[PDB]
Structure formats: C-alpha cells, structure tokens
Design a protein around this nucleic acid. Structure first.
Ligand SMILES: [Mg+2]
Ligand SMILES: [Zn+2]
Lengths: 98, 489, 13, 266, 51, 50, 79
DNA sequence: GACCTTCCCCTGATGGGAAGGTTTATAAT
DNA sequence: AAACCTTCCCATCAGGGGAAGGTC
C-alpha cells in the first residue's frame, strides 16, 4: 500500500479512507522511537503537517510544489476537537497568555 | 502563538458566552429536504450554513456577502467549517449535578461539603429532604429528614427554616457556604485534637478549599444550570450509501436531554403534582449524567442497538479515545508499507524501494520538479504525466530520490532502532529490500513480516534522518555498548 | 531534541 | 373561557373573593392530584404496552401522566360510566402521539407514521397469502394513496445507523471512522487554483490597463463582487456597449494562438 | 437502591386506590371549587361587560 | 469563482452539472472481464444493456 | 551521498546543533537566496550543507555574522 | 378617426396540500 | 387509528390594466 495525499475522515481530520490508505498508524511506541533520537521536527511534521492540520497539509503542499521546504504548522485538529469535547462538559478549558 | 493552558469550572455565563443560541427542539433535519430544522441539534441559525457561503433560504446567496446576517432564515453566511466550531447551550429547568464531580472517587461535591456520598445520592433522588440556612433553629444547616419528618417539621417553624429536596438543595448548599468561614474554624479544630482521622480529613479538605479559593472557581458551578452542546459537525448526520444515514449516538443523548427538559418545563406550566415532577427531575438528572459520562448509572441502551451509546467521556477517555488514538498516535500521509525481502547486494546505508511505492509517495516532489524543469506546463499536466507513467518521469524520480532518505519501521517497535533511516534504491517489484545486518536490530524475520516506510518532507526532517536516524550512525546499542550490526547467521 | 535549542531560546526569554 | 377570565383577573371583599377562588383552585388541584396519583397505576399498566417502540419506559409513563392530567381535567362524572375507560383513551393518545413525535432521530409528521404502520399491517396481512412477499405494486393498491407513495414512504423511515457500530468482523474498528470528507477540497485542485491566479495575472498583464480593468471588473478578479456592464459604464464615464464590445476584443486577444496555450492547459 | 424506575414504582405504590365514592366525591369537590370560583367572578364588572 | 468564470467565458466550455462516479478498475490491478450482471428495480425502465 | 556524518559531528560539537545549522544553511540554499560554498556534485542542499560543515567553513557563528552583515547592507539600502 | 377587439405583465385571490391539534365513553390497576 | 378543524407556505389562476392593431 502507498499514499501521498488521499481522502480524510470527517469526524477528525485523519487520512484513513477508501482499498487501504493512510500511513501505518504512527502509534505511541513510534513516537517514543522518535523521541529517543534527537529528531523533533520529524515528529512535528509527522503529527501536525502530514496528518492532522487541515490547513497545514495544503499550505505545505503549495510550498513543496513551489520549491520551498518550510511549514506553518498551527494546531492539530484532534486537539481542537478535544478542546470542544471538553468544553461541551461543565469544564472551562481556555488558552492563556500570548 | 499561545502559551500555557488553563482549566477550571464553567460559569453558566461562560457557557452562554461560548454559546450563540439555545437548542429548543430534539429535531435534526426536515426528513425530506435534509436542511437543518431551526432551531435544533442541527441548526443553521445557531451553528451555521450547510454549504459554503450560502444562506439556508438562499436570499443572501452570493459569496461577496461575508459577515451579513440574513433575515428570512437568520443564517450568517461563512464557510461550513464553522459548523464544526460554534457551540450552543440548553437552559435546564431544574438544576442538575455534574456526575464527574459526584462520582469521582474522592467525590468533589461530597468531600467539599464534608458530607458522605450515600447521603447526597439519597437526597438527589427525593428519598429525603435536607435543611438549608436554618438561622436559629434546632438543626444545623445540613441534615437529612424523611417525608414524615418534613411533615411535622415545617409546622414547628414555617419561616426561618428552609428545607428543600433534590439538586436545588445541593446547589443551595454550595452557594450558601463561603469557604473562608469553614476554613478559619477547621484551623482551630485541626490545631487541637490529634486523632489521625482529624488530620486526614483536615489535610484533604483544607487543601481542597484553599487551592479552590486561590483560583476563583465557585462551588455552585459543580451544579449545572446551563448545558453546553457539541458542534453539529463533530457529531454529524452525514448521509450514507443506500439512502441510510449515519450519526453519532451523542445526537440521541442530546435529543433525550432536550425532550425531557422541555417536558419538565411543560409539566411546570401545567401545575403537575409533586410525584410526577420529582420523577421528571430524577429522569432529567439521569439523562444529563448519561450524556456526560455513561457507566456510573443505568447505562442507557441504544436505539434498536443492544450496545450502549458513546458519550462525551467515552469519546475522550480509553485506549480508543481521542487521546490514545488521535493525539499521541495518528495516521500519517506520505507513508506506505509492504512485505520485505533480503537484498544482500546493498551497502549498509540503503534499502530496496519498489518503483510504484516511491512514485505514489513522492508525488508532490515529482510534480514540483517536473514543473520546475519545464517538462510539464502546469501541475495538472504533471499529474496527467505521472498517471500516464511516461518514461521521462523515472529520471525525475531518480533526481528527487538521490539525497532524500526514507524511514523504515517494523510493527513491534521496542527500542529506537525499531525505526531507521536508509537511502532509497529503486527496485522492480512490490517488496521492500532491507539490509540484512539491520534485521537483528528490527527482530525482523523473513517469515512474512511486513514493514512500513515514511518520507521526511521538510529540510529539518531530512537532516535529522541523515544525521541521527541514519543506519550508519546507529551501530552501537543504547542499552549497552555492544554492536547491533553483528553478522547474524 | 533539536527543538531544545529553540526551546532554550524561549524558556530563557 | 372561564380559565381565560380567571387569568385576566372594597379590597377586603375583593381579596376574600380571591381567597375563595384560590381555595377552589387549590382544592381542585388537590382533588386532581389525588385522582392522578391514584390512577398512576393505570398509567403504568398502559405504558407497559408500548415499551420497545423506541422510547424509554419512564418517558412512556410520564407522557401517560400528562394524558391522565388532561383527562381528569376534562372529565365530567354525571355521564356515569366508569371513568377508568375515559382515562384509557387519553393515556393511549398521549403515549402514542409522543412516540410518534419524539422517539425519532429524524422527527416525521404523525400522519406519516400512521401511514407507515398501516403499510406494515398490509405486509403482515399478505405475507403468507402471496407466498414469498406480495409484489411491490399490489400492496400499494391495497392502500388509498396514489400508489407510488409506497416507494417514497419506503425510501424514508431509514433510521440513522449509529456511527460507533463496530464494523464487521473486528472490534473496535467503528463505522464512523470510515466516513470520508467530500466537503473538503483536495490539495491538487487547490494548488491548481493558486497557479491559475498567477496565470490569469500574467495573461492580463499583456492587455491595456483599461482592458485589464474592464475584464477584472466584469468578473470578480482581485476584487469583491462582479459588476453589471452598466455599472462598469457608470464607473468609466464611457458606457454600456463599448463595455460589451471591449470584452469581446479582450477575450479575442486572449483567444488568439499566443498567450492562450498556458490557460488552455488548465 | 438507585434505579430511577423503582424509586417511582414504590412512591406511586404507596397511594391508595379508587372505589368508588372516592371518585364521586373528588368530582363533587372539583365542582365545589369551581362553584366557589363561579360565585366569585359572578360579580366581576369586566366579566359582566364582556358578556 | 471569478478566475474560472473568466476562463469559461474566454473558451466557451460548458461546465457539466453532473459529477463523475463511474466504477473504474482499482489502482495496481489488471485482468479480463468474464461476467457482467445487472439488478434492476421493479419495472422502472431498463438500461439497454440490461 | 554522505554515508557517515561523523566528521560534521567532530567540527561542530553537540551533534544536534549540526542539524540545526545545516538546516539553516540548506534553507539559505534551497530558497534561492544564496549559493553553495563547495562544488555541487549533483547533491541536494542537505549533503551540500553537510560538506560545507565538514570543511570547517560553515557553522552557527559564520552564518550569524553573514546575517548581521546583510542586515547592515539592507540598512545601507535605505539610501 | 373613434371605438372594438387583443395580448402580455403584475395584484393577489383563493384553492391545494401538508403539518399539527383535539377527542375518541363497557372496562382496561 | 380515525374524523373533523385549523393554520401556513405555496404552486397556479381570474381580473385589471396599459397600451396596440386592424377596419366600415
Ligand atoms: Mg517473524
Ligand atoms: Zn437567507
């Protein structure tokens, strides 16, 4: 199986769709394997630009085709959905100082 | 961007601050035109448009109308993505306890007011009344009285003696008390008599209330006056194949909450007897608790489905909640996997990569390089070229693959050497060729084991792969200086 | 990892 | 009308009459409460019939309670019949109407639900009669509708399936995890749009500034809205057919072999 | 116990049954309440003017 | 949007109202068609190949 | 290609900041603001940057001095 | 010509249909 | 589940009118 950019799930912006697509789910153990190495940007682009940022994926695709390898990461969508799910309860979760 | 995150109890004012409108119906869609019924769980007025930059009626339909509020349907025209962000609220007729603070192992509401859990639960069920603000009477501001006691109790003092039953009583208990008063006395109490029980209840309660007061959250907010609702697109009703629809069971739970709250309001306006309204308050408490966290109550069955319904806490917690399955670990683009083979002719710092996998993987870089070298007029033409698989694009893939390492991983990832960076070597076939000396680091047999590959996109990722995760750079094990590249069999 | 440098620039800031 | 009048409604005598009316109201409340709290068992026994119709037991008994309330309110004893029979129809109406109303994720009009139930009755009637199951037309003529309503009503009444229903043969892969997004835009078309912007900018660079302006203005390029040709005329101080004409030549110069090729590729 | 159905089952079970002058006298008491409420508002000038 | 409107105005190309969903062969597989069958609702008009 | 980066770890201690400085250099190169300091044997910006590091002619301080000079050059562009 | 007859645009008039509401009385615990 | 009544949004029609055309 192989995939660069395919469909994305609706409830949470994640690549599994359809034939199997989406990477071999980058579990917590693989996150630890990245953390043991000194690779931080690899993990960031792994779980922010390649996976969950609806803006980031396209804003990165455009820079890749422009010949400029950068990233404006932003916030992953699963964390935003979780903020909304927590705030749905009687729990007030906010984002503090600039 | 931002810094530290804060968490606290939600004021009802704050709940309404997140909220733009109140849901007042259990309806979702019109059932023929699947447009959202205003104003319900799915509502365009409260939440937003179904389609991008369009009113529900269509009078202010053009895309130039940004930020205008319609007046035939009350819809604000923006992207439909805000149908996933905006919140709503519901005004509860009777107060309702938050089951998270009631059923937490150190019950927050119970431990706060120095009261056992069984008594609070017996009060919430209208099995027994409870005093509040007695002034100068026989009983203290908190006690339990059966109905035959409450009968001849009020005959002793009609005024100066307030005694309610249910969730309103717990809210009056939380609001009546101001914790400075009950802290200043606990000071002396915990000062004098030794009594290990005394110091234990002291340390726990005194720390609770002092750290409580430091923040500013008020105890009354453990009782829910207003209920925030989840945005509709987070619990969608999207149509499925064959005319059938798919929805989160959240919708059913919110539906029951709205239905029973409106029925309670109607019973209040109908002057119903006390038995019926108490039953309805208990049922509304049950519904709210089933919504917040299903499992600490009767475990509400689904509709025509025997399994329980996924609640909000069920969405959050667990090995499949949004924490373990989404935030810590996530599916990734620009990735693949396949069965692995040997490829002994490889030098150590490389691996065999099939052609089709490398083509599907490096698609954006292929497009960029093709349109940079002028071999493609535009990006659409580049995609057409690779979909045709013209013979010229293979050399472009050679160009983009040369100094671009890839990451290989096996399923049982135990140590950091479970992931290693190699240099791609284009190979005819559909199998990955992994250097044999690394198999010991992978514990990878050739008995059908499959491995996955990932592509470092940004420059920083490529340099981290070449300098840190490279197969040549990792020869000594981290657990012990012994080499991990030892010849195997 | 790498970010530490970056982070060392921010935590000190 | 008496209720409306009392809602619309010497001070000592006025408050004495108000106390008489309020004692009557409280005594009627106590009497209706006695009657309802006594016939709660009839309510429960009736609600024990509509259990699995899609609503909870306690919801059924509470709707039957609201029924019984209106029933004891509208009852008159001089008719003499056992008023349990009178409350029966009322509780039945309350429960059935509420099941039709609020027991559906997609609320449907009540008469639609009754028609659905009639169709189910017909299918039960002709199940063994026609052998396999009666043909998709004859049960329509069994009904009173224009008989193509059968496939409409059958197309609807699909109850939305839970999103967390575990997909076949595996736990806990869930159905909601396989619902893709068709409202989002894919990256390729977005990049082609960001390139089309620059391509059109480059092609409009060749035309005269007035041609570029009228072309950008008739359409919405690099602006807010499109414009009527009369609006372009009002803005330019040359007006209306000049406008219609310039466009043509403008498009012609972009339709001519050179400068067109690139745009053609989009 | 804590199950919402039984808390209501017992509570409704306590109250007594209806035979039969109970029903008849409850109806008569409703009639007497509305009779006091009709002796009142029998001399409401707004009611006499609305009639 | 505007740029597409300008393109369609210059080249006079009808933008079809219908979206493509035709069943095409999946990626990476090839073979020969051995059997086609069709299931059609009650009396509602056939395809010709049906 | 570069099989071992050991020499670049030698010239710049802290084998992490090598990655950061080389990413800065490869960003200066790929985004066409600058050009290589060593002959490009058809290597991407990654290996070119690493080869610059190995010869001891590019690290954090040299790039920072170059940026601080370009700042004053743009200040002279004030005219 | 003057008057007689005629043909398209808006007023809304009101007929149509769908959705919603209120009762339904041997008794029914 | 059925009989009778009410209301609301709505897809079409009688009627008016403003001119417009054709003729003993
Ligand atoms: Mg094995
Ligand atoms: Zn509108």
């Amino acid at each position: 199986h192989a995939r660069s950019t395919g469909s994305y799930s609706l409830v949470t912006q994640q690549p599994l769709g359809g034939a199997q697509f989406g990477g071999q789910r980058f579990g917590e153990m693989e996150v630890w394997a990245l953390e043991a190495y000194g690779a931080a940007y690899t993990l960031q682009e792994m779980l922010t630009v390649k996976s969950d940022d609806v803006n980031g994926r396209t804003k990165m695709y455009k820079n890749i085709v422009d010949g400029n390898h950068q990233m404006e990461p932003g916030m992953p969508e699963s964390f935003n959905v979780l903020l909304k799910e927590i705030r749905s309860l009687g729990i007030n979760i906010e984002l503090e100082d600039e | 961007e931002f810094d530290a995150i804060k968490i606290a109890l939600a004021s009802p004012d704050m709940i309404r601050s997140w909220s733009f409108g109140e849901v007042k119906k259990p309806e979702t869609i019109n059932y023929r035109t699947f447009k959202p019924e205003r104003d319900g769980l799915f509502c365009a007025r409260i939440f937003g448009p179904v389609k991008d930059y369009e009113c529900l009626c269509g009078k202010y339909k053009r895309l130039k109308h940004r930020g205008v509020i319609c007046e035939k349907c009350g819809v604000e025209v923006t992207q439909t993505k805000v149908r996933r962000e905006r919140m709503g609220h519901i005004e509860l007729a009777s107060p309702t306890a938050h089951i998270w603070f009631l059923k937490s192992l150190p019950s927050r509401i119970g431990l706060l007011l120095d009261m056992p859990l069984r008594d609070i639960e017996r009060v919430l069920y209208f099995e027994s009344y409870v005093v509040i603000e007695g002034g100068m009477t026989n009983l203290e501001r908190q006690q339990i009285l059966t109905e035959e006691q409450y009968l001849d109790a009020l005959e002793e003092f009609g005024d100066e003696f307030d005694a309610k039953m249910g969730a309103e009583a717990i809210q009056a208990l939380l609001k009546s008390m101001d914790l400075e008063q009950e802290c200043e006395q606990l000071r002396e109490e915990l000062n004098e008599t030794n009594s290990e029980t005394k110091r234990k209840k002291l340390t726990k309660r005194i720390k609770l209330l002092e750290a409580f007061v430091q923040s500013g959250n008020k105890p009354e907010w453990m009782i829910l006056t207003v209920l925030p609702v989840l945005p509709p697109d987070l619990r969608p009703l999207v149509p499925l194949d064959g005319g059938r629809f798919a929805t989160s069971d959240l919708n059913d739970l919110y539906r029951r909450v709205i239905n029973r709250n409106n029925r309670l309001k109607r019973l209040l306006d109908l002057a119903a007897p006390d038995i019926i309204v108490r039953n309805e308050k208990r049922m509304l408490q049950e519904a709210v608790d089933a919504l917040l966290d299903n499992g600490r109550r009767g475990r509400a069955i689904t509709g025509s489905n025997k399994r329980p319904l996924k609640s909000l806490a069920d969405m959050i917690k667990g090995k499949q909640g949004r924490f373990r399955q989404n935030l810590l670990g996530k599916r990734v683009d620009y990735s693949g996997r396949s069965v692995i083979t040997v490829g002994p002719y490889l030098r150590l710092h490389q691996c065999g990569l099939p052609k089709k996998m490398a083509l599907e993987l490096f698609k954006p870089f292929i497009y960029g390089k093709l349109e940079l070298r002028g071999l493609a007029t535009t990006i659409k033409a580049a995609k057409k070229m690779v979909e045709r698989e013209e013979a010229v694009v293979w050399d472009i893939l050679d160009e983009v693959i040369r100094e671009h390492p890839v990451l290989l991983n096996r399923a049982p990832t135990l140590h950091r050497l479970g992931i290693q960076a190699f240099e791609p070597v284009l190979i005819e076939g559909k199998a990955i060729q992994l250097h044999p000396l690394v198999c010991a680091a992978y514990n990878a047999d050739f008995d059908g084991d499959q491995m996955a590959v990932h592509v470092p996109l940004t420059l920083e990722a490529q340099l981290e792969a070449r300098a840190l995760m490279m197969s040549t750079n990792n020869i000594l094990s981290p657990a012990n200086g012994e080499p991990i590249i030892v010849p195997s069999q | 990892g790498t970010g530490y440098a970056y982070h060392q620039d921010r935590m000190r800031r | 009308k008496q209720f409306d009048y009392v809602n619309s409604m010497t001070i000592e005598q006025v408050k004495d009459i108000n106390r008489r009316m309020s004692i009557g109201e409280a005594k009627a409340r106590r009497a209706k409460k006695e009657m309802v709290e006594a016939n709660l068992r009839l309510v429960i026994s009736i609600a024990k019939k509509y259990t699995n119709r899609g609503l909870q037991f306690l919801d059924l008994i509470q709707e039957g309670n609201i029924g019984l309330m209106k029933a004891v309110d509208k009852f008159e004893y001089r008719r003499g019949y056992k008023f349990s029979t009178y409350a029966t129809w009322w509780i039945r109406q309350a429960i059935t109407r509420s099941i039709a109303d609020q027991a559906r994720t997609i609320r449907i009009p009540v008469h639609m639900i009754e028609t659905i139930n009639k169709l189910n009755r017909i299918s039960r009637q002709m199940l063994q009669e026609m052998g396999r199951e009666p043909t998709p037309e004859e049960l329509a003529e069994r009904m009173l509708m224009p008989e193509d309503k059968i496939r409409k009503v059958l197309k609807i009444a699909k109850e939305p399936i839970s999103m967390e229903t575990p997909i076949g043969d595996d736990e806990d892969s869930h159905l909601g995890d396989f619902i893709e997004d068709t409202t989002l835009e894919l990256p390729l078309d977005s990049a082609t749009t960001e390139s089309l912007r620059a391509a059109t900018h480059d092609v409009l660079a060749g035309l005269t500034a007035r041609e570029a302006k009228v072309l950008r203005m008739r359409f919405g390029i690099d602006m807010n809205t499109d414009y009527t040709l009369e609006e372009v005329g009002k803005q330019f101080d040359v007006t209306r057919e000049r406008i219609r004409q310039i466009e043509a030549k403008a498009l012609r110069k972009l339709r001519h072999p050179s400068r067109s090729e690139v745009l053609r590729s989009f | 116990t804590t199950d919402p159905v039984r808390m209501y089952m017992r509570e409704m079970g306590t109250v007594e049954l209806l035979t039969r002058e109970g029903e008849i006298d409850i109806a008569k008491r409703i009639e007497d309440g509305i009779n006091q409420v009709q002796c009142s508002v029998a001399e409401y000038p707004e009611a006499i003017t609305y009639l | 949007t505007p740029e597409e409107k300008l393109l369609r105005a210059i080249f006079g190309e009808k933008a079809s109202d219908v979206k493509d969903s035709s069943l095409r062969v999946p990626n990476g597989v090839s073979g020969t068609v051995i059997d086609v069958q069709v299931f059609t609702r009650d009396g509602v008009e056939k395809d010709k190949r049906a | 290609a570069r099989v071992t980066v050991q020499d670049a770890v030698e010239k710049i201690g802290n084998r992490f900041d090598l990655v950061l400085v080389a990413a800065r250099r490869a960003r200066q190169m790929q985004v066409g603001g600058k050009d290589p300091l060593v002959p490009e044997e058809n290597d991407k910006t990654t290996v070119i940057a690493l080869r610059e590091i190995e010869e001891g002619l590019i690290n954090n301080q040299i790039l920072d001095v170059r940026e601080r000079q370009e700042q004053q050059e743009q200040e002279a562009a004030e005219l």
